[PDB]
Every structure is written in structure tokens, then in C-alpha cells.
Amino acid sequence: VEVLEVKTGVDSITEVECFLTPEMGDPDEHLRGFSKSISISDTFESDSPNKDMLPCYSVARIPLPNLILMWEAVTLKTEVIGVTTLMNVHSNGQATHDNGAAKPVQGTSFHFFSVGGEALELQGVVFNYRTTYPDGTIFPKNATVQSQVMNTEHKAYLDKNKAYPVECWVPDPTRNENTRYFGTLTGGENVPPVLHITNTATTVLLDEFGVGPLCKGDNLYLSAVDVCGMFTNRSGSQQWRGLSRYFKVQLRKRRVK
Amino acid sequence: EVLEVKTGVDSITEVECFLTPEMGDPDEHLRGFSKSISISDTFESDSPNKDMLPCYSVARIPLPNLILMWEAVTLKTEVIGVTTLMNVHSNGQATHDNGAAKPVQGTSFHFFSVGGEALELQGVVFNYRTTYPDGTIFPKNATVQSQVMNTEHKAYLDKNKAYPVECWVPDPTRNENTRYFGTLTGGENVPPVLHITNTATTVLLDEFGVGPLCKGDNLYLSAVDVCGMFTNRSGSQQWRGLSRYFKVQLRKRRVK
Amino acid sequence: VEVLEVKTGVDSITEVECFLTPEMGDPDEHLRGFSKSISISDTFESDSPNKDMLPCYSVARIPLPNLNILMWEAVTLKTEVIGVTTLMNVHSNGQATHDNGAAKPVQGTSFHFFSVGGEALELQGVVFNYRTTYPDGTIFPKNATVQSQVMNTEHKAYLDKNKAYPVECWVPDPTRNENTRYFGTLTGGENVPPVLHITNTATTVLLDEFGVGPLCKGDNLYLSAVDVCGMFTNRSGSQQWRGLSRYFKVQLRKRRVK
Amino acid sequence: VEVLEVKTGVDSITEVECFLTPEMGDPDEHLRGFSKSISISDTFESDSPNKDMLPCYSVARIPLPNLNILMWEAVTLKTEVIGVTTLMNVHSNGQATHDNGAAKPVQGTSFHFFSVGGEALELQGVVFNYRTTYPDGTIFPKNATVQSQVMNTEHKAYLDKNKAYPVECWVPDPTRNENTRYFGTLTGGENVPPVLHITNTATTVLLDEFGVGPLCKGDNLYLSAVDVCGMFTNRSGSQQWRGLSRYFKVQLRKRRVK
Amino acid sequence: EVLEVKTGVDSITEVECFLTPEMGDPDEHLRGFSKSISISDTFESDSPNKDMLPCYSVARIPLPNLILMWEAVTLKTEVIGVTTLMNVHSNGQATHDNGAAKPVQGTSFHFFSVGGEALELQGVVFNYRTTYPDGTIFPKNATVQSQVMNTEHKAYLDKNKAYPVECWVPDPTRNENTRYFGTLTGGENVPPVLHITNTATTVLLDEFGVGPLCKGDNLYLSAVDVCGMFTNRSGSQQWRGLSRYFKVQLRKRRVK
Ligand SMILES: CC(=O)N[C@H]1[C@H](O[C@H]2[C@@H](O)[C@@H](CO)O[C@@H](O[C@H]3[C@H](O)[C@@H](O)[C@H](O)O[C@@H]3CO)[C@@H]2O)O[C@H](CO)[C@@H](O[C@@H]2O[C@H](CO[C@]3(C(=O)O)C[C@H](O)[C@@H](NC(C)=O)[C@H]([C@H](O)[C@H](O)CO)O3)[C@H](O)[C@H](O)[C@H]2O)[C@@H]1O
Ligand SMILES: CC(=O)N[C@H]1[C@H](O[C@H]2[C@@H](O)[C@@H](CO)O[C@@H](O[C@H]3[C@H](O)[C@@H](O)[C@H](O)O[C@@H]3CO)[C@@H]2O)O[C@H](CO)[C@@H](O[C@@H]2O[C@H](CO[C@]3(C(=O)O)C[C@H](O)[C@@H](NC(C)=O)[C@H]([C@H](O)[C@H](O)CO)O3)[C@H](O)[C@H](O)[C@H]2O)[C@@H]1O
Ligand SMILES: CC(=O)N[C@H]1[C@H](O[C@@H]2[C@@H](O)[C@H](O)O[C@H](CO)[C@@H]2O)O[C@H](CO)[C@@H](O[C@@H]2O[C@H](CO[C@]3(C(=O)O)C[C@H](O)[C@@H](NC(C)=O)[C@H]([C@H](O)[C@H](O)CO)O3)[C@H](O)[C@H](O)[C@H]2O)[C@@H]1O
Ligand SMILES: [K+]
Ligand SMILES: [K+]
Ligand SMILES: [K+]
Ligand SMILES: [K+]
Ligand SMILES: [K+]
């Protein structure tokens, strides 16, 4: 519970570097990074999305050098990987007008990443409490009408990949003391992706007392969502498209009592 | 007269809570939504029903009993459930043949305040002939001048689910003991832009280093988070709101 | 004016707090804060807007406590647009955006402007179309020529009267106004969304690069504003400007001059 | 030049204040500030714009008080687009946005540019379409080849004449202009809304990383501008560029050199 | 082992150049444009022609022959010919009856890098069954995983007119000796926003005060400036690119 001094010297720092692949639904063997085409329910009550149509949170647990000392995460560099793929406007999309190029990926996006010393803590909130979330996903159980705004029963850990749908979970702001998270939802069928890349930007993960996430059990938890928008097919059907996210985290050894 | 800050383990406290949105809640299935919006045929016949009108949210939070007063110093705040807006499959209006449903979008109002007493309101109406319904508190004796400024319309945000958003704003002539922040983004097609993080803190101290001072040991939190409108298959539209998280740090302050 | 030292002590500071109502045209007894429906001229040459169709600059001259050499110096401003949430009334004789939808909200061209000075705001006249006939009861650029469409230095005036100076044919004169601080944004386009921020935590400092604010000649403070938020479209499709009031709070201190 | 110390004393500073009028084409005696209606050629090969359809760079060479070794050094700039509120004239024979609506406001592609230098702005020619035939009375890239569509180093010029250098075929040469500070933004798209800010509280410092402003050769200051605000759409749907004048205020100090 | 910077005469140098865009150049009159964009008949049959594919630009600049190494410290950069997008009078598609031509708009990628060796690339494809054309260098043995991340796709940007923009990005796992900056703005109607000035400088030093160190006395500059698409009268669309200016200041640094 008590945080003491940082250890210095040769052995005292380490670095984690990896990428998290997006989990958009992957409806067949050719469509890694895409969801199933989105269909609309016949009535509000009958909302019942298939699993392959639901983007999910990505998570990786990274083992750290075995070490009371704990690894403290201090800085992060992060980047969406493959932003230029959205320039492919020639692959059986929907022409914007007669003889025009294909409509590029656009519309509702969620870009989110977190670094923590334990699993990201989630709070469940649903657009429509009568939505039936599908077998194979982990979703708010015993949803009530109050779950449309806040039901404190819906607590969970982001402890599994391809499992927690993006639309029914958010980071729990009442918890997550040992995690730093950042996200933006940009909503609207025509919103343009705006994706920046650079290897010169660093986020500092230290809190107001100068303490970063402390890695319980010598594990680092990285989480992400990068739903870039929707690809529209020639027919007008639409699929979520996601991209991978790069993480580089620097850690240092911190003594605790 | 504000004197010194108390120190010691006993001298700080924290409030953590959420305010649910008050969008109208037209039936047992529609918490967080308004009634579908209908348009009056004339200004004179504008008479919105209560469940069609988003209202201000407010909570009065009792603090440990204490001349000392609790002083609100910092705020962390967050809109809860931003990702619900990715549900584009729930009997909405397809954007084009075979496409996904139109997402929630259009006019938004995102607002929050922290004070040591009720938020002070000034009434202003789009149309003075609008008749606000029973069960709401609204500018009384509205005149055509109420469309721009009528100083008679003063109130306190002292009741949840009662003060309609569209006819009240924070009174800039008062609110010395409150800090408030809001943004109205208009237009039927404006995209929600909702940021979340647990790394952002707002300092509530004024230019003299003094934060809101909690009269009778009560903290007042207020919010509006109308995110936009949901469009049904039929084309009818309902406001959709989300809850707001507040975490406030307070310290004891001696006053004269 | 040679500016010398600031006075201190309890008597040395004062504060002005008020609001300026918008002057959008007010075409009937039910339409305060709106203009008349906008009509388009048959030809460029025949442009001839009626008074109730033209938003005008707002101005207030606030007398300050008498001093006399001392002048009141305006140091800080807090300001806010009043009634931003009125724009959420999309249920009141508007035009549905699509079948069964809500009304189109106020949107399109906006001008948000405010100034604080120790004398009247100085104006330069510029016209979109020099053959526009501005109406009786307004004060407009006189003897307009084709050069008035870009810059004609004859068109100088003072913002010295309310409901009088149309917004479209006057701007702050950047060649003058040394004793005023002004700020404005024109956001064009027929569909631009209003973005209106409110807070009581923001202050603007009015001091120039030498540490001197507007000095109030004859102990009067001049506040000016325009807050055209956009156009309201009614059910027939006709459009009217909609404006809102602006709050001002200004802190002043006594400054000796020679 | 070796740059040495700045002179002090009352005589050591001077100010320049002026405005540059826009040069949009001026197709007739009533249309100062506008271009001719814009037409579209059938092929790249057949592109042949009329002179009065082409906006041009504006330039003023301002003589300064005679010095001779001392040179005037430009230190600060205040600048403002003049007449931003003219864009609120949406009643002057424009095209209704929809039935009973107000006229479509000026919008679409804009270029806002200004520069301050101690010699003429240096230009590099680049063309959208090398087969464009530029008209008599303009100065344009000569001997254009297909490489001129991306970069042909033959097209060097000085902005040394008003109403002459079309905006679309010239830019500031980033390989030169050491003795000039320039700033510009092109915002494209047929529906981009103008966003025009005005204030008299904003100053740009013109000093480089070594603390040295433009040094005025022969005691002349060179000011250049373009303010294409967008296009005006007439009732018929024809479109014309609309520009506005730009105010400059420059502070200069005396600098010794060798 | 990076040691001290040399000072004095001949201890600094400057590189100035421009990189032309490589958009495909489909004929002798269309330098700076791509071929008209065609849409494949099926997802599987995606097979873009070379002249339809913008590529990364690169230049290797020899430095004064020099252990000392040239260290890149600052960059000034600018897109050249921004005003060409005001040509809305040639061979375009009127935005409405009697209107000017639709200007260049839609998807853009603006990117630049400075390094002391070739930019390192990671391949990522929109569609793994896309057949990239002869004469381009593209991710080989692409699998479905290549749609998100296949670590087999590594390359150096070591050739002009060869690496298509759409299937390569800077590799964030490498490039320790390069500084790179890019923005993808997607959507068919996005307006170009192009700023020019000679007053902005980017500093190339890392968190330790060390800039790119130029191996073999070569400086590597890379760029893409796809500004958007030009629409012809027929509605067919072509990518349009512009050149990029670079000015880099370098100093001599001793190393062990
Ligand atoms: C290849 C294709 O996209 N086929 C479409 C088909 O397209 C034809 C149609 O537009 C006709 C109309 O005239 O024109 C044909 O092309 C002609 C061309 O215009 C003409 O100039 C030339 O001379 O001749 C040709 C003749 O061939 C078009 O080929 O339209 C139908 C009806 O809209 C589509 O059927 C629907 O298929 C659905 C599943 O298929 C897709 C899809 O959703 O569209 C195909 C996508 O390519 C695929 N995308 C990806 C990234 O994999 C998606 C995706 O796998 C899933 O959605 C994932 O969930 O599948 C679905 O079965 C629906 O029920 C059918 O109506 C047909 O696809
Ligand atoms: C379920 C639904 O949305 N029903 C609509 C109905 O929809 C039918 C219509 O689009 C026809 C058109 O051909 O097609 C039917 O579907 C067919 C499908 O296209 C075809 O491919 C397939 O093979 O066959 C089916 C046949 O079923 C559609 O089902 O349209 C009517 C007329 O527009 C709607 O009537 C209006 O209902 C209003 C109240 O209902 C709603 C609403 O406002 O739209 C339903 C919303 O789902 C509900 N939303 C939520 C979040 O709860 C709202 C909401 O509760 C309130 O608005 C809150 O105030 O209510 C209203 O009664 C109005 O007067 C009716 O005209 C019908 O809803
Ligand atoms: C007064 C007017 O705008 N007349 C245009 C005419 O309008 C008709 C309207 O008066 C009547 O009520 O309804 C009918 C429909 O039944 C019409 O809408 O419509 C004509 C056909 O489109 C136009 O003819 C064109 O005129 C051009 C030159 O005139 C204009 C122009 O539109 O380009 C008139 C503009 O007011 C003027 N604008 C300014 C700011 O001066 C421009 C401008 O001077 C030039 O464009 C500068 O280059 O000129 C051409 O002659 C064109 O060929 C012709 O079809 C009537 O103009
Ligand atoms: K269900
Ligand atoms: K009524
Ligand atoms: K007239
Ligand atoms: K030609
Ligand atoms: K293929």
C-alpha cells in the first residue's frame, strides 16, 4: 500500500513493446479486422446482435522480468498501425457518385487505450436494456431499464480477449486507481477518420503524486479499441473496420512496504 | 471572511457519485430517453409535454457535520457509457439501402457544476408563448422580453427532474459560490465527440485561491448531458442522455 | 494622455455588471430577439432591406463614479452569452429535418462580437454591395461608391446609438480604437452549428502590452456586442436571424494621468 | 550583412499603417472585390481563364524614413481582414438555400495570406494544369511543362506589381524569402464556411530565431496579401470569388549593420 | 556512445531540397495526378494498376564527407503550390448548375520524415487478397492476418515510385534513428487545409538531446502529400499530390 523510493542502476529499468490486434468480429476466414455486415432489428425490443457483428475490447497481459519491488509504468508511446489502408478506395466499395471512387471508411469511431498494473475495470451501460447480447460474449447480466443510464451491479474486469463488446462496457471511473485510460467516441455516419502517427510523442503515466501504475504479479495490462469507422460495400451493407495499436511502455523498479 | 485551511488527517474528505440524466423517461422501457419530439404548428400552440423535455440533474450531498466549512478544491468528472452510441442495430433508421442505422447525433448540451449551494438560474425562453407543463418549474409571467432577458426569472436548481434545460441557464449575475461549465453544440447532424480519461482534474479555486464553500455542510452537484437524438425507423426522434460521474476533493476551511 | 501610477486603497476599484440585449429587428410584438423573415432582392442593384430585417450592433454607455486628473481604467472582463439552452427548443413551429423528425435547430451564419472601451467603438463602413439601399431609421455608409465594397475611408462613425448601426455594413475600425479592446468571430455557411460555451471561471485581461487598459473619458465605460447565433427556419422554410443577450462584468481601477 | 546593435532614443522607432485592397478581377464598374463568374473549360488542354476571373496577389511597397549603415528592422505586425460582416448580406440577389429561404452565403475555397519583408516577396510558380493558357495582362509561369504541375525551378519571380500575379499559379518560394516573414492558409471544398476572427489585441513578432526581423533594403517595407473569402453564388447559380481588404500595422526599429 | 558536439567553423551544415510527389503519372500531361480510380468487381478481385497507386517519396542526400557524424537538429518543411487548388475552371464537375468546378477534396495523407538512414516500413493491407501490381514493392505472402498485423512485412523505403502508400506505414517498432510525422484525414468530402509559413521549425532532438545521426554521411528525407482527389466532368476521380520542401540544419557530433 505504501510507495517508497525508485531503485536506480543498471538492472532498474525495462521496456515493453507490442501490438494489440483489433477484435471487430471476424465473420469469416477472409475478414480479420472487419465485423459482420450490420443488420437492424425489426423492433426496438427485438435487438439481438450476432457476436460477429460486435466489436470487442482488446487486452494483452504482458509478463515482466520476475522480481518488495514492483515494476512501475512511467511512459507510453502508442500509435494506430496501418492508417494508410484507408486509402484503398478501389476494393468493391460503393461509388460516391457515377464513375467516382469508392466511399472510404468513415462514420462512428472509438479510439481507446489503457495501461495498468492489473486488469482494466469496467462498468456496464447499455443503449437498450432489452438488447439480447449473444452467446460467447460477456455482457451486463440481469439488465434493467436502469442499466440504460447506470446500474452499479454491472461490474467486470477486462480479463479476456474477443469477449467484452465495446457498446455495453466502459472504463469504470469509480475504480481504476492503478490504470491510466484514454478514449474518444466520435459519432455520426459521415465523420471522417483523422489519424495521426509519429514516433516523437510520449504520454507520462505518473499520477499527481508522481506514481505510475504498479504491476501486481509482475504483469502489465494493455487494453485498446480502435474502431476506425465503417466500410461500405457495393451493396450498401456496412462493416466495422479496426486497426492494431502499438504500445511502448517504459517501466522502473519501485520499492513498496 | 475566509481564514486559514485546516490540516491534519481529519481535515480532508472526498465525494464520489454519479448523476443520472433526466431526459423525460416516457415509459417503463425508456429511461435515458425523451418522448419523441413533435413540432407545434404555431408559436402560440407550443405546449411540450414533460416527458418530451430534458431537465437539469442535481444532487445535494450531505458532508460530515461541522466556524468551519468544507471547501471544494478539485473535480474529476466523466460521462458514463459513451460506447452505447455504437449501438447502430436497434431499430433505427438505415442511412441508405442496406446500411447501418443512423447513430445518435444532433444538438447536444454538456454541462456540469459544483457549488456550496444550489446553482442559481436565469430563465430565458426561445418563444415566450411556450406553455411549460405541470410538474416542471419554469419562468412565470413570461413576456416577449423573456425571449432575450427578463430579470424576474430567477430560480434555484433545488429539485431534480423539474427544471427544463431549454428555459433555464446558470445566472451569470450570481453563482459566486459555484463553478459551472457548459457547451451547447447545435445542428441536426453534429457528431457527438465524447472524451473519457481518469487523468484529468479541474481545480475549483477562484483567483483568490478559494473554492466553493459548503453552506450547512452540503455539496451541490448539477449536470446535463444531452448527447443528441436517436432516430427511430419511422424517422421520429428522441433525446438521449448519459449519466455523469463526479469525484470532488474537499478540505476544511475556517471562516469568520 | 501621459499615464502615471495606479491608485490603491479600498476606494480605488469599482465594478460594472450588466447585460446587453440583442437588436435583431423585432418584426412584431411576439418576436423580440428575432429579425423579420429574410427576403432576397430581385436584382443586385435593387437590394433594399427593411429595418426589421437587419441585425444591429448593441451598445451601452455606463456612467462611472465621477473623478475630477484621474481616470477609470478597465482591467478585466468576464462575459457570457445568456440563454444558450433556448436553442434546444426544436418543437416550436420549425421545419422537420425529415419526415416525423424534430425541427431544424438554429444554425447558419453567426457573428459573436464584444468590446470594452473608454469611449465609443470606432467603426469603418464596408458593404457587400454598394448599391444596397439601407433603410430609414438606420445609420449606414453615406455616399457609397464601388470602392465601398472593399475600403472607402470616408465611412467613419462611432457606435453611439442602439438599434441603429446594421451589423452587415460596419466593422470595428482597425485604424483607430486604441482605447478599446474588441473581439469578434464571423462563422459563415448556411449549415454551421452554433457552438456556445458558458462558464463563470474565465476572465479576459484588457491591459495592452504596456500594462494599460482602456481609460474612461468623462467617466463613461462603453460596452458593445453582437450575438447573432444563426437563423431559425420556420415551417414555411423562411428564415429569421436569432440573437441572444450578453452579460458583461468589468473590473476597473483608478489611474492618474497628465 | 553583419547585424549589429539596435539604436535607442526617441528617433529610433517608426510605424507603418495601411490597408491593401483585394484584387479579385473586378469584371465591371460595380464589382470591385469580386471576380467574373467562374466557368469550366471542357478539357485541360482548353483551359483559358479570363483575366477578370483570376484573383491576384496584392502588394504595397512602403517607403520608410530615409536612413543613409542603418536599416529599418520590422519587429511586430498587427493585421486584420476588413469588413468581415459584409458576409451577413444574405438578401442581395443570391440563391435561396431552399424554398422561401435566405440566400446561400459566401463560402467554399478560401486563401488567406499575408507577408512582411525588407524586399519583394519571392515567388515560385506551380500550376494545377500546365496547359492552362494564362491571359494577357497577367504575369505567369513561362515555358510551363508537365513538371510545372509539381515543381519546375525555372518559375521564379518577385511580387513586384499589383493586379498581375494570379494566386493560383504562384506561391511564396520556400527556397528563398530569408528577409520576409510569410503566413498563409488554403482551405478547400465548395462548402467550407468562412471563419473570420477580428481583434485589436493580437500581435505577431517578426523576429527570427537569432532575434532579427526583416531588414528593409533601400528603406522600403514590402507588404503582401491575399484574402479570397470564398465564392458568392448568384440567383442563377453562377459563382464569383469575393475578397476583402487587409489592414497592416508594423513597428520598426533602427538597426546598425556592416 | 554519443559524445560531444563539435563547435566552430565548418561544424554546421544545411540541406535544402524538395521531393516531388509520386501519384502514378498516368500519361505525359498528368504529372502529379494518379490514373482515374476504378472499383473492382468483387472484393477478392481487387487489383489496382500501378498508375492508380500513390507511392512514398524518398531522397537520400549526401552530406559533406567526414568518428564524427552529422546530426540533424532542426527541420523546416512546407507543401509547395497550395494555391493550385484554386483552379476550379478546368475539366471539372460543376457543384451545381452553373457553378464552379468541385475542388480537390476527400481523403488526404500528409507525411514527412527525417532520418540518418532509410525509413523503416511495416506492411498492412486493407484487403489481403488485393493483387498489388508489377513494378511496385508490396507485402509478400500476405495472409488474412496481414489485414491487421503480420510482422513478416518489413521493408526499407529505399526506392522512389515503388512503395504504395496504401499498404505501408512507418514501423513503430523500429525507426529509432528517424523522426516521422503523418496525418491521414479520410472521407470523400474532407476539405484540404494547407498552411504555409517560413517561420515554423520542428526540433529533431530526442528526449536525450540527440537528433538523427547520419550513417555514411547520408540524410534521408521521405514524404507523402496526397492532397485529395480531383473530380473530372465525367465524375471519375484522380489523386492529386504536391511537392514538399525540406530545410534541415545539421551539426557534427562525436561518437565512439
Ligand atoms: C460482388 C458484389 O458486390 N455483389 C453484390 C451485387 O452486386 C451486383 C449489383 O450491384 C448489380 C446491379 O446491377 O450489378 C452488378 O455488377 C454489374 C455492373 O454494375 C455492370 O456495370 C457490369 O456491366 O455488369 C455487372 C454484372 O455483374 C453487381 O455485381 O448486388 C447484390 C444486391 O445488392 C449483393 O447481394 C448481397 O450480398 C450480400 C453479401 O455479399 C457481400 C455484401 O454484403 O455486399 C459482398 C461484399 O463484397 C462483402 N464484403 C466483404 C468486405 O467481404 C460482404 C461481406 O462478406 C459480408 O457482408 C460480411 O457480413 O458480403 C448479402 O448476401 C445480401 O443478402 C445480398 O443481397 C451482392 O453482394
Ligand atoms: C417497429 C417499427 O419501427 N414500426 C414502425 C413502422 O415500421 C414499419 C414500416 O417501416 C413498414 C414500411 O413498409 O415496414 C415495416 O417492416 C417491414 C420491412 O420493411 C420488410 O422488409 C419486412 O419484410 O416486413 C416488415 C413488416 O413488418 C416496418 O415495421 O412504421 C410505422 C409508420 O412509420 C411506425 O408507426 C409509428 O409509430 C410511432 C410509435 O412507434 C415508435 C416510433 O416513434 O417510431 C417505434 C419506435 O421503435 C419507438 N422507439 C423506442 C426507442 O422506443 C418509439 C418510441 O417508443 C416513442 O416514439 C417514444 O415517444 O415509438 C407512432 O405511433 C406514430 O404515430 C406511428 O406512425 C411504426 O412505429
Ligand atoms: C436579376 C437576375 O439575377 N436575373 C437572372 C435571371 O433571374 C430570373 C428571375 O429574375 C426571375 O424571377 O425568375 C427567373 C426564373 O424563371 C430567373 O431566375 O436568371 C437568368 C438565367 O439564369 C440569369 O441570366 C444569366 O445572367 C448572367 C449574368 O447575370 C449575373 C449572373 O447571374 O451571373 C447576375 C448577377 O446578379 C450578377 N452578380 C453580381 C454580384 O453582379 C452577375 C455578375 O455581374 C457576373 O456574373 C459577373 O461575371 O451577373 C449571364 O449573362 C448568364 O449567361 C445568364 O444566364 C439572370 O442573371
Ligand atoms: K432482444
Ligand atoms: K402555448
Ligand atoms: K438599391
Ligand atoms: K489552353
Ligand atoms: K486480387
Place of cell 482605447: C179
Q: How many whole angstroms separate alpha carbon A186 and alpha carbon B105?
A: 10
Contact status of A66 with chain E (Cβ, < 8 Å): no
Q: Which three cell numbers stand for residue C20?
A: 446587453
Q: How far is the CA of A177 from the centre of ligand 1 (A)?
A: 49
CA A91 to chain centre: 27
Place of cell 427511430: B232
Contact, E181 vs E246, CB < 8 A?
Answer: no
E-chain CB neighbours of D147 within 8 Å are: 31
Question: Among A44, A46, A131, which residue has the most ligand 2 atoms within 8 Å of its CB, making it the best to mutate?
Answer: A44
A27 lines ligand 1 (CB under 6 A): yes
| b/e sequence D20-43, b meaning 16+ C-beta within 10 Å | bbbbbbbbeeebbbbbbbbbbbee
Contact, B109 vs B192, CB < 8 A?
Answer: no
Cβ contact (<8 Å) for D40 and E16? no
SS3 E43: coil
Q: How many whole angstroms separate alpha carbon A147 and alpha carbon C120?
A: 57
Cα torsion through D188, D191, D197, D198, rounded to 10: 110
Segment 12-51 of chain D within 8 Å of chain C by CB: 17, 19, 21-22, 29-34
Secondary-structure breakdown of chain D: helix, strand, coil percentages, each rounded to the nearest 5:
10, 40, 50
Cβ contact (<8 Å) for E89 and D39? yes
Mutant choice from C39, C79, C150 vs D, greatest count of D C-beta within 10 A:
C150
Contact status of C229 with chain D (Cβ, < 8 Å): no
SS3 A10: helix
Q: Which residues line ligand 2 (CB under 6 A)?
A: A 43-44; B 26, 30, 35-36, 91, 232-234, 236, 238
Minimal CA–CA distance to B90: which of E48, A49, A200, C220?
A49
CB atoms within 10 A of CB C249: 17
Contact, E225 vs D150, CB < 8 A?
Answer: no
Q: Which three cell numbers stand for residue E122?
A: 511495416
A155-157 and E202-203 beta bridge pairing? unpaired
E-chain CB neighbours of D138 within 8 Å are: none
Task: CATH number of the domain at E225, please.
Answer: 2.60.175.10
Roughly how many angstroms between the first and final C-alpha of chain B, as a whole number?
A: 5
Structural element, H or E, at residue E227? strand E218-231
Contact, C250 vs C13, CB < 8 A?
Answer: no
A91 lines ligand 1 (CB under 6 A): no
Cβ contact (<8 Å) for C126 and D230? no
DSSP-derived secondary structure letter, E89: S
Tally of domains within chain A: 1
Place of cell 438599434: C163
In chain D, beta strands by DSSP E: 3-6, 13-20, 58-63, 70-82, 110-117, 122-125, 156-158, 170-172, 180-187, 195-199, 204-205, 220-233, 239-243, 245-257
CB atoms within 10 A of CB E51: 18
* Nearest ligand, measured from the Cα of B91: 2
Q: How many whole angstroms separate alpha carbon D112 and alpha carbon D226?
A: 5
CB atoms within 10 A of CB D63: 11
CA B125 to chain centre: 17
Count of residues making up chain B: 256
Longest dimension (CA), chain A: 69
Minimum Cα–Cα distance from C129: chain D residue: D92
Dihedral sign computed on CA atoms, order C23, C27, C29, C34 = negative
Q: How many whole angstroms separate alpha carbon E192 and alpha carbon D188?
A: 5
- Burial level of B251, CB count in 10 A (0-12/13-18/19+)? middle
Write the CB contacts of B45 (distance below 8 Å, at least 6 apart in sequence).
Answer: none
What backbone phi and psi angles, to 5 degrees, belong to C174? -70, -10
Q: How many whole angstroms separate alpha carbon D27 and alpha carbon C147?
A: 14
Dihedral sign computed on CA atoms, order C154, C159, C161, C163 = positive
Cβ contact (<8 Å) for C107 and B52? no
A-chain CB neighbours of B92 within 8 Å are: 40
Minimal CA–CA distance to A117: which of A10, A6, A214?
A214
Minimal CA–CA distance to E88: which of C28, A204, D221, D109?
D109
Amino acid residing at E212? P
Instruction: Classify residue E233 as left (phi > 0), alpha (psi -120 to 50) or beta.
Output: alpha
Method of determination used here: X-ray
Write the CB contacts of C245 (distance below 8 Å, at least 6 apart in sequence).
Answer: B124, B148, B149, C19, C20, C21, C22, C81, C82, C83, C227
B-chain CB neighbours of A189 within 8 Å are: 95, 99-100, 102-103
Mutant choice from C159, C179, C190 vs D, greatest count of D C-beta within 10 A:
C190
SS3 A9: coil
Please give the full DSSP string across chain C, using - where no structure is assigned. Answer: --EEEEP-SGGGEEEEEEEE--BS---STT-TTB-------SSSTT----GGGS-B-EEEEEE------EEEEEEEEEEEEE-GGGGG--SBSB-BSSTTPPBPPSBS-EEEEEEEESSPPEEEE--S-TT--PPTTS---TT--GGGGT--TT-EEE--STTTSBGGGEEE-TTS-TTEEEEEEEE-STTPPPEEEEESS--EE---TTS---B-GGGEEEEEEEEEEEEEEBTTS-EEEEE-EEEEEEEEEEEEE-
Q: In Å, how far are A104, A167, B36, E81, E110 from E107, measured between CA atoms?
A: 8, 28, 37, 18, 10
Amino acid residing at C59? V
Looking at the DSSP bridge assignments, the partners of residue E76 are E247
> Whole domain around residue D202: which residue ranges?
1-258
E39 lines ligand 1 (CB under 6 A): no
Atom of ligand 1 nearest to the CA of A31: 52
* Interruptions in chain D after residues (C–N over 2.5 Å): 68
Looking at the DSSP bridge assignments, the partners of residue A196 are E183
SS3 B168: strand
Contact, C135 vs C169, CB < 8 A?
Answer: no
C170-172 and C156-158 beta bridge pairing? unpaired
Q: In Å, how far are A158, C155, E120, E139, E245 from E168, measured between CA atoms?
A: 31, 59, 10, 8, 22
SS3 A50: coil
Contact, D76 vs D204, CB < 8 A?
Answer: yes
Half-sphere exposure of residue B131: CA atoms within 13 angstroms, side-chain side: 9
Nearest CB to A145; choose among B21, B29, B201: B29
Q: How far is the CA of B39 from the centre of ligand 5 (A)?
A: 12
D3-6 and C180-187 beta bridge pairing? unpaired
Please give the full DSSP string across D45-73, using - where no structure is assigned. Answer: TT----GGGS-B-EEEEEE------EEEE
Contact, C59 vs C223, CB < 8 A?
Answer: yes
Please give the full DSSP string across B74-122, using - where no structure is assigned. Answer: EEEEEEE-GGGGG---SSB-BSSTTPPBPPSBS-EEEEEEEESSPEEEE
Resolution of the deposited coordinates, in angstroms?
2.0
